[PDB]
Amino acid sequence: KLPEAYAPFDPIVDVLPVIPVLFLLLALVWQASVSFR
Amino acid sequence: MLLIFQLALFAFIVVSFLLVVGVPVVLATPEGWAENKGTVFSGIGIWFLLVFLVGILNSFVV
Amino acid sequence: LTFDQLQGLTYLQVKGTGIANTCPTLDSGSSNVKDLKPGTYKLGKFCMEPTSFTVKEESQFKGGDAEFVPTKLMTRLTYTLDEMSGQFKVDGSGNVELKETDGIDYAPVTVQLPGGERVPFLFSVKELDAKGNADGFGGEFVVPSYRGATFLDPKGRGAATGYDTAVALPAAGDDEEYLKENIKSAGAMKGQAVFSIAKVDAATGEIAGVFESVQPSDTDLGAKAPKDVKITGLWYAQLS
Amino acid sequence: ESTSLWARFCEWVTSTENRLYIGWFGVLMIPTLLTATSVFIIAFIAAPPVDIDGIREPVSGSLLYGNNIITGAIIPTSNAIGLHFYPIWEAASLDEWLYNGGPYQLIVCHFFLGVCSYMGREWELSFRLGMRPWIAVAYSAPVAAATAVFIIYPLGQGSFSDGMPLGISGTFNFMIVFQAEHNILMHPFHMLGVAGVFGGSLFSAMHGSLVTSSLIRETTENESANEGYKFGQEEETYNIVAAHGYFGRLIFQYASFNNSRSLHFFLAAWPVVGIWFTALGISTMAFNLNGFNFNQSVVDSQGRVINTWADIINRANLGMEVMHERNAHNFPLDLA
Amino acid sequence: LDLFDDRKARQAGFDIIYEARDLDLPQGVRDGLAQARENLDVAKARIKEAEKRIDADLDAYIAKAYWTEGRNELRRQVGTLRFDLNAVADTLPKAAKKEAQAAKNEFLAAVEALDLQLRKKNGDKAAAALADTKAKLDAVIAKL
Amino acid sequence: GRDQESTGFAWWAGNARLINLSGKLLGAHVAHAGLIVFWAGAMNLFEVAHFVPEKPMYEQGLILLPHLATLGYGVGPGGEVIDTYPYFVSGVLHLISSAVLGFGGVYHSLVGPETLEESFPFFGYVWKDKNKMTTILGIHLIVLGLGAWLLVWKAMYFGGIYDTWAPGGGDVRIITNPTVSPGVIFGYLFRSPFGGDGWIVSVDNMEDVIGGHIWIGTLCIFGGIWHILTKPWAWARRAFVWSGEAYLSYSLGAISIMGFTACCMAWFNTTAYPSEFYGPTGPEASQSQTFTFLVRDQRLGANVASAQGPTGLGKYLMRSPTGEIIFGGETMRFWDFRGPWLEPLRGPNGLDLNKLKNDIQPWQERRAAEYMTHAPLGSLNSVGGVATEINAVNYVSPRSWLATSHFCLGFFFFVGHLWHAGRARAAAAGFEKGIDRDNEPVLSMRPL
Amino acid sequence: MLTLKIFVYTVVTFFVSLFIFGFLSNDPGRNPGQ
Amino acid sequence: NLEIVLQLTALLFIVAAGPLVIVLLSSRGGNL
Amino acid sequence: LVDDRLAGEGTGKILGINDPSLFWAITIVFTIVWGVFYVSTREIDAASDRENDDDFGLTL
Ligand SMILES: CCCCCCCCCCCCCCCCCC(=O)OC[C@H](CO[C@@H]1O[C@H](CO[C@H]2O[C@H](CO)[C@H](O)[C@H](O)[C@H]2O)[C@H](O)[C@H](O)[C@H]1O)OC(=O)CCCCCCCCCCCCCCCCC
Ligand code: CLA
Ligand code: CLA
Ligand code: CLA
Ligand SMILES: CC1=C(/C=C/C(C)=C/C=C/C(C)=C/C=C/C=C(C)/C=C/C=C(C)/C=C/C2=C(C)CCCC2(C)C)C(C)(C)CCC1
Ligand SMILES: CC1=C(/C=C/C(C)=C/C=C/C(C)=C/C=C/C=C(C)/C=C/C=C(C)/C=C/C2=C(C)CCCC2(C)C)C(C)(C)CCC1
Ligand SMILES: CC1=C(/C=C/C(C)=C\C=C\C(C)=C\C=C/C=C(C)\C=C\C=C(C)\C=C\C2=C(C)CCCC2(C)C)C(C)(C)CCC1
Ligand code: OEX
Ligand SMILES: [Cl-]
Ligand SMILES: [Cl-]
């Protein structure tokens, strides 16, 4: 587990590792916004 | 110091969220990197200050 | 390699070399077993490394002079019996009685005769009880069945497990043609081994010599007649 | 012009005037594939039985030893060998080499080098002819599948005896045991592989039927329609717009490729991508990352397990598991 | 079937294998770490037996140049020495605990230096390293 | 950015528009670097949070914590995790460092210079400049050498590295005599990849592991200085395609090999990947099963040496085709396996029969029993055991995840070599867009 | 068998050497375009 | 269930932070 | 033992060189091929029509 001082912040850590796969989708939605120019 | 430490960590998380959205927006904005460049450096400076503040406070709380 | 030389080698220095399949050689020592104090010793590190496999073949040239023809080893370096233990009793008059108890005491070996015939056999000295003088002391040993009672043949037929008939033939199964193959037995046989002492080191309690063993081959769980296999080689042991 | 021996040799090797292109990958492909071909033909006809399981129970795989074309096979190397290198010179006699399954390793090792060099030789000719270099990429899909069943799966399992036998019935034994140990049917990658070949078969039939349906009339009815095409034609032999119109009405207008270049990329990508994943599937299952295991997934309120179709598959998998390599296992777990 | 009386099997740990394969039990219980920590007497006993192996078997192995036997003996019945030394040293008072840890590190350095010489097959340096190892071990046990 | 109208690359090949935009290409590579450091930090904290001390590391689906444990952080003797705080600061340090790395990626991509060749000649480059390319190769070669020296400094001066072969049980150990002999180093490099040899996957000492990284650290530094002070020779100039896409394909072919090697390292090696943290290997688990049944059947009373199987071979003990005494059954294939719990029972000739029936320590039995049940077999949905098993145990070995994933990455990055190297030659030759309709090469060749 | 091993080592080295020095012989220049 | 509520809440922000950047640039006529 | 074999399997020998004669087999063959290649480099490059200077080679 995390140290006791960092216990309230545990839920944030539980969703952090999925952020990098969001960048792939973020690039896709960025290209859609500019009409895939 | 536990309450002080967690407030500093929460403040660090909040300012990180502001930079996560604020920095790309001003960078993409043409006038942003010329005018808002001043307030971005303040955000970066505050972010680094909280990094060291949370870092030292970790010693007295863990 | 003597026993001390082998113990001075790491496993990585032996793995793949092939010297793991060699009985230790007894250098120096003596040629007189009389140097051994009479008594009942504890046989240890007994190992028998074959030096030749010959299989007796019936002579088609009449005369009935069935002789042991030379063979070609087929299963690589997996044919030395080692770690065999037991008791060794030395008599003042030179009488010798050796009795094996545990250890490998068996190794499946396959050799190929001229003509491409693979003859498997279970090279074993199981329950070896040899009595005699130092120059030659022989005895009989148990040769168990090459295949265990639960060995399934390619049709699923076995002795203690499997079909008792040819299931592939729903009608012609259980005919007189297939009765022999359907019924399988795992009975054991016996062989004769004659040992001889050539070197004896009283100080270290180590003995060595040669042996000759004659035993039957695999009977294919009673499906074929066993051939006669003559195994000649060296042997080594540590009395203690 | 070239006077040096090497300059003349390198011109001949890379010459595009040879009936069969050699190239530099061909100086590796030709000797390896001929070596594997020679031993394969000789072993398929006259090789002695091979003790595949390491339990001194030889398995006959040769025509001269009682097999037909369907049941004949080159038996994999003995389980006693494992992954150890077993060239003919590491055997005391050629009889011992044959008994332990030597020819399998000789074929597989030279064959793997052959297909890798065949893949490079495909690139090399494209470069010499000035065409785009990705036919070799499409050939990487069957190469990966061949590499997975002959090299990687034996590598992960720990023995060349677990490779695919070089035979028809031997292939079926490979698949059945593979299902029993890994549940390959429930693996998403064989699922993608099946969609790759079912889809590729569908797309081949559709593309072939659509082009054939749109052939521009250039012959009579007493001649083959093929005669309407002359090798080297600068004009198109079928009407792409007409074929698109048919398939557009068949489902709907935008479900059809109006672009021949996009259509042909799709014809190449779909089977190649599918075979890439099923090749990965066997490779992943080489390290025992099996397919989906839904056994006893559905239980009622009181805990009683309600069977599904997955459990019926497990019953079939159970039967193969307890029968493959009958005499080879002394202990209950099939960890090897 | 014919019956056999193996009721003695539970003694000498027939269930050690079954205990280690029980996922319900924590990892400490499966690996035997919890038992040694709970009952320090078994931990102290294994330290004494490990001392016996070092001050006896190793000397013969080095003299006879049985290098593989010496290295294996340093890891068989001794393969729990590091854990056992830590287990006993933890119970010591903090002031004594610090000194026991320093002594333990000295012994561990000597036994690894001895292991190098056995690997190098250097009899002279191994005998010198063995004598140092035996001296360091006595100091550690005295503190524990 | 750009568009297909002015570049000729569609959106799905959009990053190909950065080939000659060195400044934006820099930000692209720095931003992906921030992602790598971000994942390392985020996954580290994720594993630390989801870590329960009642289970071993390999039973919890952790793949990053074992890497920290092998470096000797928060592990006591015997592979027991004593403190996870070192694992925490590793995650935090990476997570924070990714932020500044991410900022530089975003800065150098969106608002920094597009091309560095004008404003910053030191960092500016053109792919055709072989001299400048080698300097960049030389510079980044030195930092790799320095990174290798960090490992040996950790293993020799800073705490040490976890040694699973350490006398007295596996523990963190200071490496004092690294093996830097040329014969040992060259022996691993040019060893066969087949069984028994295993190429470099068979390194079985931490002395050899950090002895090798001393060679790698030194070679990379000398190679860095070499490739900085020299430009490629004529033989190299006429052998390689000097284009940006060509240099990429060279690296793709290289890390494809590295991906495959990591797959085999995680699957076979037990030194750099201790079984205490990564779990048993494939060979280890199969070897542990026969060892477990050998031990339990001895107590029931049976001579394991004399016991026969149905096939006639030894049920418990047999001989390898080289003569060594090995475990019987199907695990005869894994006879070249070596493990910390099994070597004490092995003498020069193989497994020692006397030690197998007299001196089997309880800890050795417990290790083998644990390794057998955690064999590297599992399903896609992480159901432990063979495919013909019920949904009871939720376990897949980290070795299975590491080997399976990095083989798929290794193979796809080999297709990267095939793709990006083929296109590199065609584009340089000048026919990557198609055959010239008026100048078709085949039309000018003699018919076959 | 050593004679066989030396023969194969000679043969394998021969074809590999041709492959290595073949691609070192200005291979990229052997293309039909300009 | 407070844990999963917090996890979904934190997940809500991050899956929105990305699109929030794009829509702000699109609305403000940014160089995106 | 009963038969003779190289017994080099699984021994981790550099390039599989059990005996020094294999070294001469590889070295002699490589040197010969390298020898004929070395005396032909200039001729091969001459076909390029460029001189193998610092700007030689396929370059995009
Ligand atoms: C034209 C364009 C076309 C585009 C097509 C695009 C297609 C996109 C396809 C995506 C397919 C993947 C879908 C992912 C979401 C599915 C839900 C999920 O995943 O959920 C699955 C699980 C669920 O989470 C938890 O997963 C755990 C898995 O066990 C792990 O933890 C256990 C302890 O609980 C044990 O320790 C065990 O050993 C350990 O493995 C347990 O099952 C928990 O009960 C469970 O809650 O994982 C998790 O969500 C967390 C992990 C998820 C990400 C993992 C990525 C890393 C993968 C590495 C291996 C790669 C490849 C291997 C080969 C594969 C061959 C197919
Ligand atoms: C560090 C390695 C690397 C780098 C720097 C590049 C760089 C480049 N590649 Mg390349 N490539 C690589 C590896 C790499 N590639 C590998 C490993 C393969 C084999 C699959 C390819 C196959 C490939 C092709 C076919 C093409 C390129 C192309 C390009 C250029 C533009 C690509 C682009 O705009 O992206 C755009 C990105 C996308 C459109 C999104 C891609 C969607 C993928 C499938 C995401 C799937 C993720 C998922 C987790 C994968 C599942 C399997 C996984 C678990 C292993 C660019 C310079 C293009 C080119 O030739 O340029 C001229 C081109 O067409 N690459
Ligand atoms: C690791 C992934 C990665 C990276 C680092 C890049 C990087 C880059 N891409 Mg690319 N791309 C990718 C993946 C990636 N791409 C994929 C998967 C595809 C297929 C869909 C594409 C397709 C693509 C195209 C078609 C083009 C690029 C282009 C570019 C370049 C400029 C983009 C730009 O200026 O527009 C501006 C983008 C925005 C204004 C929106 C993004 C705003 C920020 C960056 C989002 C991230 C916020 C972040 C969380 C903030 C935290 C940072 C810090 C405060 C902590 C740039 C260097 C362009 C180019 O080639 O330049 C000539 C372009 O034409 N890419
Ligand atoms: C989704 C993409 C992805 C992901 C998530 C991973 C994830 C992982 N990879 Mg992988 N990889 C990938 C793609 C990916 N990879 C691709 C595309 C390839 C090419 C095909 C590879 C090739 C590859 C190889 C060859 C290896 C991995 C390995 C690993 C594992 C360890 C990572 C590591 O430590 O790296 C490296 C870490 C760093 C670069 C940071 C440390 C750098 C410095 C020098 C270290 C200094 C440490 C120092 C001693 C600490 C002491 C403190 C000091 C002050 C003294 C990890 C779980 C390793 C593994 O475990 O094998 C299975 C490994 O060997 N990968
Ligand atoms: C260029 C571009 C791109 C990309 C980009 C990128 C890739 C970026 C990255 C970025 C990044 C890479 C970022 C990062 C960030 C990070 C951060 C910001 C951090 C944070 C942290 C915090 C806030 C804290 C935490 C904590 C600790 C301290 C301890 C524990 C607890 C916790 C967890 C709470 C794209 C695709 C869009 C396209 C277009 C262009
Ligand atoms: C570390 C941390 C942090 C940071 C974070 C971050 C960095 C984030 C980012 C994130 C991101 C980066 C996000 C993004 C995402 C994306 C999305 C969400 C999208 C999606 C999309 C979709 C889903 C769709 C697509 C498409 C189109 C539209 C086109 C066509 C096709 C399709 C439909 C497919 C914070 C602050 C929290 C603090 C704490 C710590
Ligand atoms: C760390 C360590 C170690 C190792 C170390 C080392 C020392 C490594 C190295 C390595 C090296 C040192 C090398 C390798 C590799 C290389 C390669 C693999 C490649 C080659 C390539 C290529 C690519 C070729 C090509 C060619 C040429 C000639 C030119 C052009 C043409 C061609 C393409 C044909 C050991 C084991 C102890 C273990 C522990 C750790
Ligand atoms: O070798 Mn061919 O099949 Ca792969 O699992 Mn274990 O090992 Mn044997 O059994 Mn099931
Ligand atoms: Cl079967
Ligand atoms: Cl088994």
Residue numbers in the entry:
A (entry chain K): 10 to 46
B (entry chain Z): 1 to 62
C (entry chain O): 52 to 291
D (entry chain A): 9 to 344
E (entry chain U): 55 to 198
F (entry chain C): 13 to 460
G (entry chain I): 1 to 34
H (entry chain V): 2 to 33
Paper text:
PSI exhibits a different structural organisation among the photosynthetic organisms, while PSII organises itself mainly into a dimer, regardless of the species of the organism. The green alga Chlorella ohadii, which was isolated from a desert biological soil crust, copes with these harsh conditions, including extremely high daytime illumination (~2000 μE).
We isolated a highly active PSII supercomplex from C. ohadii and determined its high-resolution structure using cryoEM. The cryoEM structure of PSII at 2.72 Å unveiled 64 subunits containing 386 chlorophylls, 86 carotenoids, four plastoquinones, and several conserved structural lipids. We identified OEE3 in the C. ohadii PSII structure (PsbU) as four bundled helices laying atop CP43, contacting PsbO. PsbU extended N-terminus contacted with PsbP, supported by a subsequent helix–helix interaction with CP43. This arrangement has suggested a major function in stabilising the entire large complex, isolating the OEC from the luminal medium. The Psb10 polypeptide N-terminus was located at the stroma, forming a cap over the interface between CP43 and D2, subsequently establishing an interface with PsbE and the PsaF N-termini. Finally, it formed a transmembrane helix parallel to and in strong contact with the PsbE transmembrane helix. PsbY joined a triplet of transmembrane helices that were formed by PsbE, PsbF, and Psb10, while running antiparallel to them. Together, they shield the heme group of cytochrome b559, which otherwise would be exposed to the membrane interior environment and could easily contact with potential deleterious electron acceptors. Additionally, in contrast to most preparations of eukaryotic PSII, where QB is missing, in C. ohadii QB, it was clearly identified at its binding site.
